[PDB]
Structures are given as C-alpha cells and as structure tokens.
Ligand binder design. Structure first.
Ligand SMILES: C[C@H](CCC(=O)NCCC[N+](C)(C)CCCS(=O)(=O)[O-])[C@H]1CC[C@H]2[C@@H]3[C@H](O)C[C@@H]4C[C@H](O)CC[C@]4(C)[C@H]3C[C@H](O)[C@]12C
Ligand SMILES: Nc1ncnc2c1ncn2[C@@H]1O[C@H](COP(=O)(O)OP(=O)(O)O)[C@@H](O)[C@H]1O
Ligand SMILES: Nc1ncnc2c1ncn2[C@@H]1O[C@H](COP(=O)(O)OP(=O)(O)O)[C@@H](O)[C@H]1O
Ligand SMILES: [Mg+2]
Ligand SMILES: [Mg+2]
Ligand SMILES: [Mg+2]
Ligand SMILES: [Mg+2]
Lengths: 368, 367
C-alpha cells in the first residue's frame, strides 16, 4: 500500500534525533524547523512528482562526499515519504536576501568556486569509470524538473509564450529579443547542450537564493534540479545571479559583485584544474592543451547559460527580488532593460571572450 | 532462465513460437539459420547477455521508421537473450561484396536514408524530451560502449596491449603516438562519445553490419546501440567506404567515392526533410539553425571517421579490406595511408566545408 502522507508540524515532530514551525518560502516544498539543538525536515508536496525529493537527498549526500563543509549534513532520507532530514542552517542568511540588504560576503565566491570545481569534476567521466558514471546518469535522470528549466530558462522568454511576466514598459525591448533570429539560434544551441550533454551531475538551480551565507560560512542548498548535464551550467547560473545583484546596486557598491564574478571563475578554474591533475582517470588528461581547451569550452557555455539566466529572470515566469524591488519604477524598467541587453550580449559573444575579466569589462560598459 | 541454445533446441523454440533443418552460421553470438526460412540470434555470456535486449529493441525501433532497411523481428526474449528475425541469406554482407568488386549502386541512398531517419526520429528534435530521457535509460549500454570507448577512441593512440599492427608500420604508428594535437582532438571526440546523448545510434555501422545486393540494403547487428552523438554512425560508415577505396586501385575507387558523397547528401537531405516535417522544436524553422546543426554533425562525423580509419588499421579489430591487400608492401603502404588520412580527418574536421572537400582531400593524400 502507498506510504506517502503529507506531513504537518506535529507529524514532523522516532528517528532518535520540542516545538516546530513550517518555514518554507515556496509552496511545493514544506520545510519544518524543529528546536536544544535544532533540525530541518523538508518534504515534497505532490503538479510535480515527489520523486524530486529522492534526487535532492541523493544529490546532497553526493556533494557532501567532496565538499561536506559547503552543504548541510543529511541525517536521514526517505523516498516514499519524500523526506530529507538535514542540518539546521537558520543561523545563516539566504545569500540573495543578504546581498540585497548590502552584505558583501567576502568568501562567497571562494566557497562557491570550490563547490563548483569539486562537485562538477568528481561526478564526470574525467573522474569516474564511464560504466559507473552511466549508472549515476540513470539514478539522477530528472525529467520533470529538467522540463521546468528547458522551458523557463531556454525557451519561453524568447517567444510570446504565456508563462512570461513583464511590465508593458519593457515590451519594445522584449520584442527586439523575439525578433532577433541570431541570438535565438544561439539560445537553441545552448538548450540543445542542456538537453543532451550528460557531462556531470549538476545542481541545476544554483542561484543566490539556493545559498546560505554569513561572513565566514557558505552552504549550498536545494539541489532538487540535479541531473547529468553540461559542466558550464551551474557556473553560468551563479555568475548571472551575481550580475543580477550588481544591476540592483549603484556605482561603487557594485564592485564587490564584480570581484565575486572574477573570483568564482578563478577559484572554479583552479579547483577544477587541481582535481584534474590529481584525480583524472583519463589517459588523455596530462597532454598539454587538453585541460586548457576543456576549460575554454566550459567557460564559453557558462557565459551563454549566464545570458539565458539574465534574460529569463527579467521577463520570464520566475523573477528575482534583485530586479523586482528596484525603486523607483522607471529605474526598475531601465535596469531590467540592461539585464536583457547584457544577457543577449553574453549569449551572442560567449565564444569571443578570452577571460572572466573580458566578461566583467563588457558588462560594466553596457551598464554605464 | 537462460540456456545457450544448440541447433536442436533452436528448432524447438521456432516451433513453440508457431513459425517455421538448422545450421549455426555465426565467438560471442550464435546465429541459427532454420529452413521458408528464419534466423535465431542468441548472446553467449566476458560480455553481458543484456546486449541482446538492446539489439532487439534497437531493431524494432529502426523498423518503425525504415522497415525496408532492417530485418523484421518476429519475437524476442531478454532472459534467453534471443532475437528471432527475418532471414537475409539471399543477400551478401556488404564488406565481402565490396571486396569482390561489387559496387552496390543504391547502397549509399539506402544507408543515407537509414541514417537520416533513425538519427532524427529518436532525438530531442523529434521526441518530447521527457519521452527521450526514458529511452536514454532503456538504451544505456555500458559494456558495449566500453569496448568502443577503448578500441576506437583510446588504445590506437597509445602503446596499449590491444593494438595489433605490422612492425613495418611502427615508425608511422609512433608518429601518431607522439602527436599531441591530434590526440587532444581524439580526446574531444571521445568526450563527445561519452557525454553527448543526442539520439539513439547503431554504434557499429561498418560495412560488415550491412546486407546488400543490387537492389536491396539491410542494416543488422545494432548491439552497440545507445544514446550518443548523431555524427557517429555517419562517420563510422563513411570511414568503411574509404577503407574499401584503399583496398582498390585507380579507377575502381570511384564507386566508393561516389558512395561517400551520396551518403552524406542523402543523409543531409533526409535529416532536413524530417526536420521540416516532424520537428517539435519552437526553434526549428529559424533560418540558419538547421544549417548550423548539420555543420556540427558534419564536423563530428568527419572526426569519428578519422578515428575509425586509424582504429581499424592498427587496433585490436581489423577490417578484411586492409588485411587482405596483396603484396605485403602494398598492404603496409595502404595502411600507412589510412593512418595519415584518419589523422588529417581528425585535425581538419572543422575546416571542411562540404563532403566534396573531404573526398578531394582524401584523393590527394592517397595519390
Ligand atoms: C573595452 C574593454 C576593455 C576594458 C578595460 O580595459 N577596462 C573590453 C575587454 C573585453 C572586450 C570584448 C571581448 O574581447 C569580446 C569581443 C571581441 C571583439 O574582438 C570586439 C568586441 C568584444 C565584445 C570586446 C570589446 C571590448 O574590447 C571589451 C569589452
Ligand atoms: N537547512 C535549512 N536550515 C534552515 N532553513 C532552511 C533550510 N533549508 C531550507 N530552509 C528555509 O526554507 C526555505 C526554502 O528552502 P528550499 O530548499 O530552497 O525550498 P524550495 O525548493 O521550496 O525553494 C529557505 O530559503 C530557508 O529560509
Ligand atoms: N538476418 C540474417 N539473415 C541471414 N544471415 C544472418 C542474419 N543475421 C546474421 N546473419 C549471419 O551471421 C553473421 C553474424 O551476424 P551479426 O549480427 O553481425 O553477429 P555479431 O554480433 O557476432 O557480429 C552475419 O555476418 C551473417 O552471415
Ligand atoms: Mg530554494
Ligand atoms: Mg527547490
Ligand atoms: Mg557484426
Ligand atoms: Mg555485433
């Protein structure tokens, strides 16, 4: 008989680990805080299969094997119940919220860069026997959550589709995008890579709202969207959300975010490189120029994906607080115009950039 | 459940199934011909017998789109590792025919159509991505992919135990081993083989996986099928046309060069028609998108062709086209050319503009 039952505060409060409050922001997932000493119980609500909870638990445990300091500990998980029992991180702040409040989080980019480099390297064919990796591909296939992304980041913003949500003051600029054949061709190629390039186990939703942060600590959460896809993807989505915060700031306040974009690519590239040297199984790994060309391709896709995330967050179904809370209204429109414009340039020009500072310097010029 | 068959128990299965003397005409796979006639193929246990599930499933899928270009499957069973199929012994394996000097005028149109349709119709272009992600699971082929990952993409390029080549070839083989830039390129193509889950491929589409006569073509043995790069079956087939060209002299080569041009042309035209007609992709009709898609397939196809050319010359698994060339010295010379053309194909793959450029490069090198 079926064993799933949607939890409540009492039901959540037998595993051998006095008061409980549901603190979930969304509505697809319940998050139960139990308090001593504290604990979190996350549970999927059923339209999206509850299978996502199996993916999420498994992804967190996997990430913990390589970067246990950058992810919450998982004490228990259950597939039928769609439950993940994990470490309480309420003493930290969601990074998107903190950044909007003016926190700079000096280590954010070192920490995320390390997370990206290790997670993305160690689940790849570089690191794993291909026969092992092919099994992990099966275990982490995520059709419904991939469908969300395939539509929202890669498809809907580029056409007059019903999921989009944007001010009419933006219509002229949005229609300029829709009519742009060559940027759309490129977004199709990026989407095709998303659909087909089973390179590693990615997080699949690594924006600033999926990170807990304080001055000295960083933790990545909510790998619901995990599956075998392109290595550049998590890197692009994260970098884009740094740029999205930049656009919500003015003048010299932007500098910390530009430094984070630079630092996260750099740390990613070092971390991925050191893991490659020390732990690759490939006979081809140590041939001069092979790692270099591999990183150049990741870099290029990462910038393309960033462009998609920049556009998608601005005019698509799922927005970001960074742009939506900008005041006054006319400034909001202007900054949302620029996210559209930079995202487009990112997509079009992705293979012309040589370094991360090329990308930052282009961005800075477009947002002057 | 599983029991390896013999000629007698193979006859018993045929009658038990309600269909219709027996000889095993196949070291890993038995093929039982039963005479109205019928074929019963069975996997033997080191390599998983799960390959027989993949082969039967692949043949049935291919039959949905090109039923005239694959044998009919009357019955299959996973636990017995059995595929019961149409008898094609009135046809000749294409490799054998081509070596005897048969030219098979329609071979390239038939395979071009096979390629275009099979490769389009199991892709994200043709299928709901949710459906396609299920087929990826179903066709995951770790052991047979491992053979390819090692034999076509890795061992030939290093001093590995599986390679098998004449000592007279050593200088040219060592030239390849010491070539960093071709090997970087071979790595990229391998990485694509390992990661690019674009469509359901045959995975072993050489001239010995084809039955042929003047008027008929049938593709067989899709044991190696899995979700991989679209360019792969195209490259491996083109390379085996070039391998036969090298076993011929002078003007007798021209039919093979025509086959290479024709198979790309037919492939490109079939894939294009299927794209216009049957794509699910909102991006499908934007001018330049199909064109750029084909350019990438072309480039990979040519790279994979170079790997197959090298691999068949000096790796574990050879081709009769090269190994039966006489005299010995001529053999060494032509095997040197396969190595050098395969190398050129890998390194120049993104410089070619059309199939004619590929052929004209090849013809120049083998003058
Ligand atoms: C002007 C600033 C220099 C900043 C600075 O010096 N601070 C920089 C550094 C990186 C440069 C771009 C990239 O190269 C890619 C691309 C190459 C084409 O060739 C020309 C266009 C484009 C967009 C470049 C223009 C320009 O040159 C950029 C924005
Ligand atoms: N481990 C945790 N510790 C403390 N709070 C958490 C924890 N996990 C989630 N939360 C709270 O619940 C919110 C929703 O978490 P998240 O995993 O992103 O759910 P969803 O998938 O619904 O977005 C977070 O923004 C955070 O405020
Ligand atoms: N459908 C068939 N009709 C007639 N002969 C066949 C048929 N299938 C296979 N054979 C014979 O058996 C041989 C091996 O078949 P194949 O499917 O290539 O097995 P393997 O996977 O061992 O290469 C073929 O070359 C052919 O001579
Ligand atoms: Mg979240
Ligand atoms: Mg989530
Ligand atoms: Mg065979
Ligand atoms: Mg076979």
């Amino acid at each position: 008989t079926p064993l799933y039952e949607t939890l409540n505060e009492s039901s959540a409060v037998k595993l051998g680990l006095l008061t409980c409050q549901e603190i979930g922001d969304g509505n697809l997932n319940y998050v139960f805080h139990i308090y001593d000493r504290a604990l979190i119980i996350k549970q999927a609500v059923p339209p999206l299969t509850i299978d996502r909870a199996r993916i999420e638990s498994s992804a967190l445990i996997r990430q913990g094997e390589h970067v246990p300091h950058l992810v919450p500990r998982v004490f228990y998980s259950d597939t039928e119940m769609a439950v993940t029992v994990m470490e309480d991180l309420s003493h930290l702040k969601i990074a998107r919220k903190g950044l909007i409040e003016g926190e700079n989080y000096p280590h954010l980019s070192q920490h995320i860069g390390e997370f990206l480099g290790k997670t993305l390297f160690y689940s790849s064919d570089y690191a794993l026997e291909p026969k092992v990796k092919k099994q992990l591909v099966k275990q982490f296939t995520n059709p419904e959550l991939c469908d969300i992304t395939e539509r929202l980041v890669f498809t809907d913003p580029f056409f007059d589709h019903d999921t989009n949500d944007f001010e009419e003051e933006l219509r002229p600029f949005v229609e300029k995008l829709w009519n742009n054949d060559s940027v759309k061709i490129e977004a199709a190629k990026l989407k095709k890579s998303f659909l087909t390039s089973a390179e590693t186990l990615i997080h699949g939703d690594l924006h600033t709202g999926s990170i807990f942060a304080s001055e000295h600590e960083t933790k990545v959460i909510d790998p619901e969207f995990a599956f075998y896809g392109p290595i550049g993807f998590d890197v692009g989505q994260f970098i884009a959300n740094l740029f999205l915060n930049a656009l919500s700031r003015d003048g010299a306040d932007r500098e910390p975010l530009y430094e984070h974009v630079n630092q996260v690519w750099e740390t990613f590239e070092e971390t991925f490189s050191e893991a490659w040297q020390k732990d690759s199984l490939d006979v081809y790994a140590n041939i001069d120029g092979y790692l270099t060309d591999t990183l150049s391709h990741i870099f290029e896709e990462a910038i393309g994906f960033a462009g998609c995330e920049l556009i998608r967050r601005t005019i698509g179904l799922a927005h970001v607080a960074d742009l939506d809370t900008i005041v006054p209204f006319d400034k909001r429109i202007g900054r949302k115009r620029l996210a559209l414009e930079t995202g487009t340039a990112f997509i079009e020009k992705r293979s012309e950039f040589k370094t991360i500072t090329d990308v930052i310097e282009l961005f800075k010029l477009l947002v002057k």
